[PDB]
Ligand binder design. Sequence first.
Ligand code: SF4
Ligand SMILES: [Zn+2]
Ligand SMILES: [Zn+2]
Ligand SMILES: [Zn+2]
Lengths: 732, 49, 385, 299, 97
Amino acid sequence: YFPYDYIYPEQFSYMRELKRTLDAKGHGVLEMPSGTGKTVSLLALIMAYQRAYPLEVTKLIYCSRTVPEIEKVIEELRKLLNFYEKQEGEKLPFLGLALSSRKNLCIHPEVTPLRFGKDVDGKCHSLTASYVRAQYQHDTSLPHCRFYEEFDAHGREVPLPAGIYNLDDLKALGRRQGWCPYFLARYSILHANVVVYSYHYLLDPKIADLVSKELARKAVVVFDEAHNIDNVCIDSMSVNLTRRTLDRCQGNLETLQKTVLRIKETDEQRLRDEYRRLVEGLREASAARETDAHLANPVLPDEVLQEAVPGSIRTAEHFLGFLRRLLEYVKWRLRVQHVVQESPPAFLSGLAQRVCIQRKPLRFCAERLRSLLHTLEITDLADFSPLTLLANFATLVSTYAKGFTIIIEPFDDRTPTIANPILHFSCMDASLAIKPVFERFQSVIITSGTLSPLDIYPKILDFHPVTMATFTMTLARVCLCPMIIGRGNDQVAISSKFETREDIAVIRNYGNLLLEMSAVVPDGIVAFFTSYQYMESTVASWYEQGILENIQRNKLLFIETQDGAETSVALEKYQEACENGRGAILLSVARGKVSEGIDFVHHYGRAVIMFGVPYVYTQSRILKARLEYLRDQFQIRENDFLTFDAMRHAAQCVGRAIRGKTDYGLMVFADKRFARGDKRGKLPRWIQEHLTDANLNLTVDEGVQVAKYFLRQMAQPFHREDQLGLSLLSLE
Amino acid sequence: SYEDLYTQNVVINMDDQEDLHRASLEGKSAKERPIWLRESTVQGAYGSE
Amino acid sequence: RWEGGYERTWEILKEDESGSLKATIEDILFKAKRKRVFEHHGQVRLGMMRHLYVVVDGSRTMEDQDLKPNRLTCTLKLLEYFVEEYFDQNPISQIGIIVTKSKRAEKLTELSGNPRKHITSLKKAVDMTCHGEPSLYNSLSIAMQTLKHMPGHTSREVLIIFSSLTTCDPSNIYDLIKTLKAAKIRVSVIGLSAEVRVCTVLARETGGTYHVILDESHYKELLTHHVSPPPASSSSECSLIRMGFPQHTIASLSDQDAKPSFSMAHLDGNTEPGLTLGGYFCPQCRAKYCELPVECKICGLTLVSAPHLARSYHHLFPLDAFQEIPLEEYNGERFCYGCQGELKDQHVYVCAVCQNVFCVDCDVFVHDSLHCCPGCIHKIPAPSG
Amino acid sequence: KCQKISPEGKAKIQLQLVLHAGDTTNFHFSNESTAVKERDAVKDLLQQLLPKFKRKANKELEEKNRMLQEDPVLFQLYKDLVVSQVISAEEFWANRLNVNATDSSSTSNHKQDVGISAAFLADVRPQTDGCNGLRYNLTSDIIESIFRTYPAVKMKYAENVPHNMTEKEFWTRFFQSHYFHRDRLNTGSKDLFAECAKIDEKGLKTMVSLGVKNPLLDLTALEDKPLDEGYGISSVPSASNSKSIKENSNAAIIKRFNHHSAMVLAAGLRKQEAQNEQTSEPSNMDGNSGDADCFQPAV
Amino acid sequence: AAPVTAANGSDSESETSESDDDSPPRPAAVAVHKREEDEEEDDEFEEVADDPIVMVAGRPFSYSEVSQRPELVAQMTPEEKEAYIAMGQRMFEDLFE
Ligand code: SF4
Ligand SMILES: [Zn+2]
Ligand SMILES: [Zn+2]
Ligand SMILES: [Zn+2]
């Protein structure tokens, strides 16, 4: 038993769900809204299992979606370790591995404070296993990467580290006795009772290593916030190419020609000596760490990538074969970007007719390009990163162009103009990135609160026998207060799904309701719009009538920008004003950058405003191809897929202001489209406990009076309310 | 950051004040003063009570 | 398509007599009345002297239609009852009235213990215009400078009442919390609607409470709790000397008009002139003036007598009620100790010292004015005599 | 700004009052009594009679003697006790005058309002509209709010006036577009842009030194990890590049964002110098639905 | 006796003001008048500016109506001349300056 939070009851329902998974042995779906303790109650049942002496093989890899939430999972798992470590008396060891790669890497001051992740890790690996593997020992070239050599020493040895560590625990241990996040991460993957990281590593058929053994029906995988999986399984394996990246790929390719040209006959013989070893060999020592950086296993739903380096017989012969893959690609890409065209067999069959080669050297050219510089290795990833984007695009053609498509949007179509052309090559059936995950492990359990419409869940085409919702029995319903404002028989103008600045009735209603809510909300207000086009037209219209000027009198304005550099500095100013002075207001987009995972609470933003249904632009041809393929599997579900993606992002912007129970958040759906759809693909605990009362056909005048009930009754819960259990589960 | 102009200046002075409220009485007389009608019953007057 | 749904809606709304047969509106009323919470907090302090500076908000938000269409006449009118009740139970203590308007903090009344001066001053604020933009740092920094002159022996708490504006923080009030603690002062914040978190920590670090008014009846109950001194105990505030013990005189012998009355022209009591009938005088200076417990102007200390001055503070000290005991046999004398008759409707309250049975009219008077038990005179002084 | 009327040829008579933000409100006259003689009277009496204001120019002091000079009634008591050599000057500033000098000491250095986040933010909107038309300053220091928001004006006014130029030609340069706040000035946009960049750099170092929760830092490394930028490139797809609309409506909002968000932060750094560290209490991480109110003082 | 000396005030001082204007007299006669006809020979709307009443020989007239006529400038009482300069702080302050 884990004495901490009051008993609803809730752990009794989560205990039965974890028992049928091991018996049925399949994927399970569990609804865990943000209003219920999905961390204290979950981690209390998970360590009872870590002590499963009977259960022969028991694992957990647990993920999340943001780098702060990793740390959140850590700390919460810390304390439940604390208490029944105290309670059960004699403590058995533990490990939870927050495995953060790039952005949490290097302790050398020369390397660390350059801003990006990938390029600087290329400088790191170029130093470690490109200059100090080639120049294998020296005095200046072979840089003081001294604790990699300390890893060499204690990787020969056997330590036993203590427990689950933070991200900064491993940097502080970097200073003291913990070594490299990567390499200690390797030694601790060798035995780890719990590794916590992001699910983007597993759901990416490229550099995914599965960090598992050869067992295909063992281990336990637990996902977190896996509601938005339809796009991750497609955007991960998606590849693209622009004229700017293609121009740099051709410029850096000429530098490689001058490297081989200046090689005489003595050094040239050493390059051909390793070519024979790679053919007769198959377990090369370079497959331990350099595989994770370069394209590891692009054919994840198939087998591993290991061939007898085809398409090469000499060193200079491989350069001409790769040069034809660049001089012909620039001639085929520029000729198809003149007009619009969408045909998967146009690029697959067109490339084979021009370049008269086989599908074997074009498939393995990505791995051979990395091994080409391993022999000379005097290079570095800064000059190799533009060459990787071209080799990654060719890999998705020899064994993936038989089920994908090519979208060409050159002349003004959600893409840059003629100054920077771009082509699209994504997927449709979001199941190729999750099928190897279900086959490599035993059972995978996803935990999402906003994922409530389960009728559209078979989009992934995967079985799910474990299905259960969550109601959370609560005495006082002052936790949340969903409200729907849609004017009605007074103006009926509140929706704008295909209108820009043609009318001023809907824009005026959005400013009149927001101005009144800015004086009654006790803290901050976190509003969201539809897209970037309708958001800029609404703010610009308030400058003429004089609506945004009155908002500046009370709260401070915060609008999401476009660049990622000015976005991080804008959120820090919002968190400082809401905690020190008066809570400000957020005017962003439902799919912007403050909607992925901010975890803002009461002292940051306890009010949620939704301006219309957050739909998507289906007129674009980058999304129509993803929906056209659904008609081959589901004909009648051509419209329900758009409703799911619209209500999922709407609940995601709502399921963030509250985390425990005493947060008391407020959400507003100021749109008339929320009429009958609020009783189907919505939260089951909102229909019976909130949406039962008549509060859907409200207007601007009525929406303020209803909002006063949540802002006035909230002052009563102050001393004690729903306190059941008495730290003993009520003897249940 | 664009640029704007035309008729953008600052006004400074030091005068006015001293006797300004005395003019509000004359302008208010142009409207209508609050008063009832000339009550006259030519018989018996009231008695408050 | 309106009549297609309006015609069928009236058919259901017309048959509203069927809902009256069910006991829904009746079963909830009997269950909501039995919900008697019990959170007795020991709000009591040995310190008899208290200095308070009530802050009254005068912004444009004092006209919202909440409890009444004119909020400006809701705080000013109910504050007169708090001032009259303050001098009723604590006549030796005094309060202050500080308003805030036009981004300024203008102190209305001074630090005096005149009940008539504070009541009549609130009626003048009716014609006061409500501009807006309230300032909390201005009305709080001035109150500390005046309160600093008081010697360290009192609670020197500060009361702040505003219209529950969304975080009334001018410019970082958290930096002032480290300064207010050095002055050993206390801040009390009262809310009216929305929650104020920037003032909740201020009421906890300095020493006080935070409550939000929910109804007109809740605002009167909260002011009663502030009549008692805040429960605390310090070591640097426990030194005081020279207490003024005046005596009541009539300034006459047989007739009031035959004598020059009291509080006239040539009399030294020129603070509040007029035509009264009597007053107090300092035993160490023989200075006759108003009989109101105020600070004299010849010594430098307030008047703390004993009959109807210092006793009012001790009369509120025994704050305790009575307990209950259920039974299923109908027995227990059923004779009240004060009014003989009872009620005979499941109402048995006994005492924890003398065990006396009271009715519904006697138990209310105990916790409101009697403050003790009549049986403690015919039982406790019995063995000692 | 300017008013418009109707000529003698037009049968209708409408009055138009052009404001400053582009709002034009028409006023069609309908006075049945006298309209021909009053449609010009409204025009004439609004142009032949314009209000004015007063600017006090007197040397101020900081000693306690200022409290007696401002009140001629209270000053008579100081001449009857101290000047009349009947008592001592120390006895008057002890108990006779103590309840008045305390409250009057706070209004000797009070610059309009102390706050900037709530007590003054609700009144800074009508003060940051430095345009022309017909507007004029008031008696109180109305230009002090610009000094708290634009630190570069304080240095340019003391190092060049009355050095190079005087007050007759200096204020209209900075106020060439105060409502726009990012116009181009030949007087020194170089000093104004460098001052705004220093405030944005100083305010950014304060947030980096703290760092309690920055989810946007990992969003960059999350998209760059799979070597895919199919979503970050299509940031604002307004589909209006040659029309000068995408870089016009967006630029007019983001530029005003850095002026209003950094205004509160710049005023807060000049008060406590970022020494509070945002409270920093361990109760922020704790989110349990319980309490610990068991210790009752004085019970 | 008590090491406190905290006093009051945190950032409210400076030097108040007394530096908003105080400029030597330089302008005199106005030269601005805008337009009075009917814009570019149009209709409906007409441009109307400002023009205070100046006293000239005891007869009320506009300020700019007298400055445009040199025969009405030197023919006035010296007492009204001091007011003619003080009235110049309107169009010289609204425009230019
Ligand atoms: S290995 Fe560990 S230390 Fe050496 S570069 Fe990568 S981080 Fe920096
Ligand atoms: Zn005395
Ligand atoms: Zn009784
Ligand atoms: Zn008793």
